[PDB]
Amino acid sequence: AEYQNIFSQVQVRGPADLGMTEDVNLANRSGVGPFSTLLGWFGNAQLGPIYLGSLGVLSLFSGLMWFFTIGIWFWYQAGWNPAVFLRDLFFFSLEPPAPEYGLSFAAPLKEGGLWLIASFFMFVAVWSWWGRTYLRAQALGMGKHTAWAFLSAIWLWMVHGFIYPILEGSWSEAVPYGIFSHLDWTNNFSLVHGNLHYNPFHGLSIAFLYGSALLFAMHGATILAVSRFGGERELEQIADRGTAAERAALFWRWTMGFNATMEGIHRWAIWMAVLVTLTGGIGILLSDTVVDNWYVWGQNHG
Amino acid sequence: ALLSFERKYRVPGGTLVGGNLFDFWVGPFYVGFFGVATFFFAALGIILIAWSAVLQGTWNPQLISVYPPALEYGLGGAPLAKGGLWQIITICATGAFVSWALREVEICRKLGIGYHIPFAFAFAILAYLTHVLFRPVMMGAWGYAFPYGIWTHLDWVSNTGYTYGNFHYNPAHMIAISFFFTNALALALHGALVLSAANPEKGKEMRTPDHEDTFFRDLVGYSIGTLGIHRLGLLLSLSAVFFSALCMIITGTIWFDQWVDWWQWWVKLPWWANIPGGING
Amino acid sequence: DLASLAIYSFWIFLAGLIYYLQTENMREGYPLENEDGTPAANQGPFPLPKPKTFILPHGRGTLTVPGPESEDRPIALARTAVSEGFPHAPTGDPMKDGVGPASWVARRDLPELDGHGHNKIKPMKAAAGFHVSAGKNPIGLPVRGCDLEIAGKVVDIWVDIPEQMARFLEVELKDGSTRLLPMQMVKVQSNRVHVNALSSDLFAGIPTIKSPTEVTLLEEDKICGYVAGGLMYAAPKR
Numbered sequence: 001a002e003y004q005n006i007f008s009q010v011q012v013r014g015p016a017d018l019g020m021t022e023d024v025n026l027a028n029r030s031g032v033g034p035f036s037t038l039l040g041w042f043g044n045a046q047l048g049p050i051y052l053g054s055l056g057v058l059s060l061f062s063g064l065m066w067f068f069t070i071g072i073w074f075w076y077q078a079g080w081n082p083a084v085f086l087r088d089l090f091f092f093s094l095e096p097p098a099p100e101y102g103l104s105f106a107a108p109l110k111e112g113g114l115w116l117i118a119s120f121f122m123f124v125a126v127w128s129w130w131g132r133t134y135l136r137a138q139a140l141g142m143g144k145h146t147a148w149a150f151l152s153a154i155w156l157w158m159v160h161g162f163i164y165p166i167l168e169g170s171w172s173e174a175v176p177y178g179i180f181s182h183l184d185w186t187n188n189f190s191l192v193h194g195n196l197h198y199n200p201f202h203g204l205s206i207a208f209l210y211g212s213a214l215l216f217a218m219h220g221a222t223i224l225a226v227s228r229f230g231g232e233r234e235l236e237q238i239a240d241r242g243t244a245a246e247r248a249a250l251f252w253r254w255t256m257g258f259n260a261t262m263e264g265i266h267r268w269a270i271w272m273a274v275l276v277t278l279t280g281g282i283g284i285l286l287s288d289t290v291v292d293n294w295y296v297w298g299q300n301h302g
Numbered sequence: 303a304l305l306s307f308e309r310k311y312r313v314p315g316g317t318l319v320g321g322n323l324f325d326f327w328v329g330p331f332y333v334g335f336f337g338v339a340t341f342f343f344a345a346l347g348i349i350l351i352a353w354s355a356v357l358q359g360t361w362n363p364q365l366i367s368v369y370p371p372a373l374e375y376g377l378g379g380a381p382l383a384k385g386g387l388w389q390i391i392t393i394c395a396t397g398a399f400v401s402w403a404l405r406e407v408e409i410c411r412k413l414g415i416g417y418h419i420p421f422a423f424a425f426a427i428l429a430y431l432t433h434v435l436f437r438p439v440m441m442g443a444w445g446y447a448f449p450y451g452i453w454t455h456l457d458w459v460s461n462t463g464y465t466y467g468n469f470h471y472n473p474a475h476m477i478a479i480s481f482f483f484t485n486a487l488a489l490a491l492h493g494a495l496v497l498s499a500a501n502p503e504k505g506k507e508m509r510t511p512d513h514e515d516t517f518f519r520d521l522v523g524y525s526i527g528t529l530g531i532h533r534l535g536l537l538l539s540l541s542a543v544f545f546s547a548l549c550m551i552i553t554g555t556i557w558f559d560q561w562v563d564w565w566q567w568w569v570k571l572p573w574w575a576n577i578p579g580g581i582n583g
Numbered sequence: 584d585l586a587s588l589a590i591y592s593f594w595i596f597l598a599g600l601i602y603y604l605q606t607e608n609m610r611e612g613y614p615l616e617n618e619d620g621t622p623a624a625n626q627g628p629f630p631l632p633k634p635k636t637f638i639l640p641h642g643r644g645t646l647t648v649p650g651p652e653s654e655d656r657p658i659a660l661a662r663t664a665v666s667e668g669f670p671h672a673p674t675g676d677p678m679k680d681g682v683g684p685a686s687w688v689a690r691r692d693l694p695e696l697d698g699h700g701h702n703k704i705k706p707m708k709a710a711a712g713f714h715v716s717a718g719k720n721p722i723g724l725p726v727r728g729c730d731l732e733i734a735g736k737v738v739d740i741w742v743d744i745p746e747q748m749a750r751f752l753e754v755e756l757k758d759g760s761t762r763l764l765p766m767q768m769v770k771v772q773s774n775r776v777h778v779n780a781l782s783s784d785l786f787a788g789i790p791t792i793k794s795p796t797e798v799t800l801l802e803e804d805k806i807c808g809y810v811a812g813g814l815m816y817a818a819p820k821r
């Protein structure tokens with residue numbers, strides 16, 4: 001039997017590589033953390049350092065408040081009782097304000113107003129955060145690829161709890177922070193607009209999600225069978241092809257009628273997925289406002 | 303008909319069976335015994351897919367569809383039209399994913415690399431099998447499987463799920479869902495990185511596998527590093543699918559009731575089980 | 584309606600992405616060559632993209648693809664048949680010759696750098712502060728081939744300084760010289776390193792490095808490659 005380089009067989013360490021530097025302000029860099037012999041069987045064993053700018057704080061700060069505001073209220077419902085808390089942990093839920101309030105900011109604390117608070121923070125913490133991944137990429141004079149891909153999500157997120165909700169007139173159309181509740185919220189939304197198996201921008205999103213699990217499953221299996229040729233180094237194969245990428249290639253082209261490259265395969269991917277939340281943000285964005293039943297429209301196509 | 307660097311490879315060998323007999327190409331397509339096989343099965347299949355569309359009385363694809371043998375047949379033979387074909391059409395579909403897997407193997411041998419690929423692939427095979435071979439035999443009835451159809455199999459999913467109410471509650475199916483989510487978040491990145499390392503701001507030198515790392519670390523205080531990621535991925539997926547196949551082999555055989563119910567066991571725990579307040583008191 | 588519109592228009596958007604994608608993936612390997620290396624008739628439906636330029640680092644230059652395709656070397660292979668798509672016999676010894684599974688590429692005779700500009704791949708004994716931090720250390724351990732005979736021993740491990748990772752095992756052969764082996768192709772155990780790929784007697788054949796403290800990209804390929812090839816040409820002894 002052979003080595004499947006799934007986990008390394010030997011670990012090795014050296015000092016801490018405090019990372020490149022370029023324009024980055026090393027002042028906001030943190031001190032390095034410890035090395036785990038754990039992650040080490042899988043990937044790096046090095047933890048840290050971490051760049052916490054002003055933005056890094058903001059985002060994280062609102063990040064908690066958000067997460068906290070949800071805690072308080074869960075504590076309220078459990079009647080300040082721990083065991084309860086631990087028992088009904090999943091059924092608790094901070095629901096949006098009521099349909100009557102529509103899109104107003106008067107909603108009484110106990111009915112929506114605490115749900116608004118929490119969202120307010122989540123926004124800020126999601127946008128400020130996106131933002132960081134920009135700058136960091138900039139401090140690295142690197143491709144805003146990442147900063148873009150992420151947006152793709154913020155997309156779906158933005159529709160799911162702000163765009164769509166503003167288009168149906170009321171806060172009561174958004175999702176509630178809850179573990180089982182939102183689960184259902186989904187289910188209902190499915191039934192409330194014909195069946196979603198029909199909404200095509202949903203049939204599509206399925207495709208990609210699925211697709212990303214098909215692709216990624218490949219790229220990895222692949223890279224792995226051609227590491228014994230220093231293939232993991234996709235970067236330096238790009239700039240100076242090796243037998244790694246050649247072999248990566250011919251296997252697929254002798255298999256499925258074609259092939260990618262080492263830079264390329266990375267663009268397939270990137271999209272293959274960026275599109276799950278893209279097609280989506282649409283799909284949902286349409287059901288109800290532009291199409292009240294999806295089965296129907298599966299008959300007329302208008 | 304060949305890539306610029308294709309010739310220095312096309313040597314003979316790599317055959318698991320038949321020797322050189324089928325050791326050759328056709329278009330950029332490798333062949334081998336299994337190349338053939340998946341041809342045999344595929345065709346034979348596409349054909350019995352045409353007989354049921356006539357026996358069905360239509361040639362619109364979205365409409366075409368072939369159905370399992372109804373519950374009444376059990377786990378035995380069924381008249382063509384009512385399951386019979388569905389049965390041979392599955393056989394074929396099977397022999398062709400399998401063949402298609404082995405051929406891949408021969409390739410990993412002529413190209414002398416890893417078996418990571420077909421291996422990986424063997425999972426989606428499994429996932430398939432569960433559907434048309436495992437779950438059914440335990441629930442004792444072919445019928446329980448899905449219908450090969452463009453929308454009919456969708457409805458096969460829609461009703462089967464709801465047979466257990468909201469399916470979100472089947473927990474094994476929560477798991478499966480997480481992976482199908484991260485995985486994708488993964489590829490999302492790998493691709494954003496690699497490419498944000500490889501296509502820097504205009505005017506600068508390619509970046510380095512070193513820059514990649516620094517990113518994340520300065521972003522989420524950690525890097526799994528280029529080999530790991532590519533390992534992470536293999537897992538995120540194979541798992542995501544390992545589990546699905548799981549939450550289905552259990553639905554109807556060991557848990558068949560309301561899924562959402564299952565979850566009582568937790569709230570119905572001695573200590574807190576009674577206490578008043580919350581949502582279950 | 585707005586929904587029909589949007590669903591078509593996406594299709595269009597989707598087609599065009601496919602394009603862009605497909606092309607982008609041809610900056611290498613393309614154009615196709617006939618079985619004698621002369622351009623091909625049918626280049627398919629997709630065109631060669633307009634060349635793009637990579638500004639390599641550490642002044643090592645520029646890369647521009649699509650570029651002028653060159654194997655840059657001799658291929659000891661000949662047709663076994665009259666018509667196309669057949670195998671291509673190895674005139675001699677595929678191992679030495681650099682063909683098939685053993686094939687190796689003409690990549691710069693330079694080594695991979697890290698991002699600071701100092702040699703990416705170094706050998707432990709010179710790697711400052713680098714030690715084995717976990718697992719069965721193979722240093723001093725005996726190397727056994729596929730025929731089950733000893734062939735040398737381990738004297739050092741080379742490591743990816745930046746990615747703190749292990750990629751090779753400097754092996755000292757019977758004749759006092761060393762050969763590098765591909766981690767990913769060895770199976771360290773309790774009392775021995777076991778290489779399935781090669782048998783004792785071919786260990787020598789493993790190509791050598793000019794510098795003992797660094798290895799050039801071109802150099803890695805030749806090794807691994809040779810190593811690989813072992814899987815199929817070394818089988819009559821394994």
Ligand code: BCL
Pocket residue numbers: 202203204206207208210211214347348351395430433448452455456459
């Ligand atoms: C996983 C749980 C359910 C299931 C649930 C769903 C759900 C839910 C959805 C689909 C959807 C799809 N499913 Mg399904 N599907 C199942 C099992 C299968 C099997 C099988 C052999 O078991 C097949 C071929 C398919 C195929 C398909 C696609 C036609 C379509 C998705 C596109 C996609 O993302 O592809 C991923 C892979 C690729 C893009 C690769 C390219 C290969 C293409 C897709 C092959 C098409 C083959 C054609 C159907 C068969 C031709 C055979 C003839 C003999 C020539 N499903 C099981 C039973 N499927 C989606 C849909 O309805 O879209 C309109 C959708 O929303």
Ligand code: BCL
Pocket residue numbers: 067122126153154156157186187189190196197201202204205206207209210276277279280281282283284459460483
């Ligand atoms: C029973 C209900 C319906 C149904 C109803 C819906 C509904 C309703 C929706 C989907 C949506 C989706 N469905 Mg569905 N769906 C059904 C059946 C299926 C089947 C199947 C095989 O049967 C499949 C494959 C799918 C697949 C999919 C996906 C393609 C898509 C979601 C992508 C995603 O990952 O979003 C998840 C990704 C994100 C949320 C990314 C954004 C990340 C955010 C911003 C991060 C927040 C972080 C937080 C602040 C921090 C937390 C951690 C901190 C440490 C605290 N559905 C059934 C039939 N489906 C969604 C869609 O958009 O459809 C068009 C959607 O709205």
Ligand code: BCL
Pocket residue numbers: 067070071157160161175177178182183186470475476477479480481483484487
């Ligand atoms: C698009 C379709 C639906 C939808 C459909 C589904 C479906 C279907 C499933 C989930 C599941 C989950 N969904 Mg959801 N989900 C939607 C919108 C959201 C929103 C939001 C702000 O809009 C959030 C925070 C979540 C969050 C979650 C997770 C709790 C859980 C998945 C784990 C996972 O894969 O993690 C991946 C995470 C990462 C890669 C990031 C790391 C973050 C870590 C793991 C911490 C997460 C903490 C969690 C969010 C805390 C919740 C408690 C707070 C008090 C609110 N969903 C929309 C409305 N969701 C799955 C489940 O079963 O859960 C139990 C599941 O099956």
Ligand code: BCL
Pocket residue numbers: 186399426427429430431432433459460462463464468469470478479482542543545546547548549550
């Ligand atoms: C109301 C319905 C229920 C529900 C009921 C079910 C049920 C019931 C099932 C799933 C299953 C799945 N569900 Mg669900 N599911 C729901 C909601 C969701 C949501 C969501 C966001 O709401 C999500 C993300 C999912 C996600 C998922 C997936 C994890 C999983 C299917 C993937 C898989 O492994 O396929 C398996 C993949 C394969 C079989 C494909 C293998 C490839 C084959 C062999 C090759 C085909 C080749 C082709 C014919 C030829 C191509 C060649 C041509 C020339 C091109 N569900 C709701 C709540 N879900 C399924 C599962 O777990 O399956 C195991 C399942 O049975």
Ligand SMILES: CC[C@H]1c2cc3[nH]c4c(c3C)C(=O)[C@H](C(=O)OC)c4c3nc(cc4[nH]c(cc(n2)[C@@H]1C)c(C(C)=O)c4C)[C@@H](C)[C@@H]3CCC(=O)OC/C=C(\C)CCC[C@H](C)CCC[C@H](C)CCCC(C)C
Pocket residue numbers: 059060061062063064067125126129130133146149150151152153273274275276277480483484485486487488490491522
């Ligand atoms: C195709 C789209 C895919 C995708 C992409 C994606 N997600 C992304 C990105 C991208 C490209 C990011 O750049 C961003 C990221 O940063 O990723 C690493 C992100 C991200 N995707 C996330 C989640 C996520 N993505 C998902 C999905 C997907 N993401 C898709 C598959 C899903 C699911 C399950 O479908 C989830 C849950 C986030 C983790 C992350 C963006 C982070 C964010 O928005 O944060 C706001 C800030 C907070 C929540 C801060 C507080 C966190 C804790 C509550 C703190 C409390 C404890 C701590 C110990 C306290 C310490 C205190 C100190 C004082 C000591």
Ligand SMILES: CC[C@H]1c2cc3[nH]c4c(c3C)C(=O)[C@H](C(=O)OC)c4c3nc(cc4[nH]c(cc(n2)[C@@H]1C)c(C(C)=O)c4C)[C@@H](C)[C@@H]3CCC(=O)OC/C=C(\C)CCC[C@H](C)CCC[C@H](C)CCCC(C)C
Pocket residue numbers: 210211212213214217218221255256340343344345346347348351391392394395398399402419420422423424425426449450451452453455539540541543
């Ligand atoms: C972790 C599991 C994930 C995964 C992995 C995966 N798929 C893989 C591999 C791997 C590792 C491959 O190596 C292999 C490949 O080579 O891909 C390029 C493949 C592959 N995954 C494929 C499809 C596929 N994978 C899917 C999913 C997934 N694959 C998961 C997300 C799905 C979805 C989303 O459901 C599909 C459709 C194939 C394109 C390809 C393998 C090629 C192949 O099997 O070819 C031979 C094909 C035939 C012989 C087709 C004809 C068959 C019969 C004669 C008739 C048709 C019968 C069938 C029942 C009809 C169904 C109709 C529906 C409408 C109901």
Ligand SMILES: [Fe+3]
Pocket residue numbers: 219223234266492496532
């Ligand atoms: Fe990659």
Ligand SMILES: [Mn+2]
Pocket residue numbers: 192288
């Ligand atoms: Mn509505």
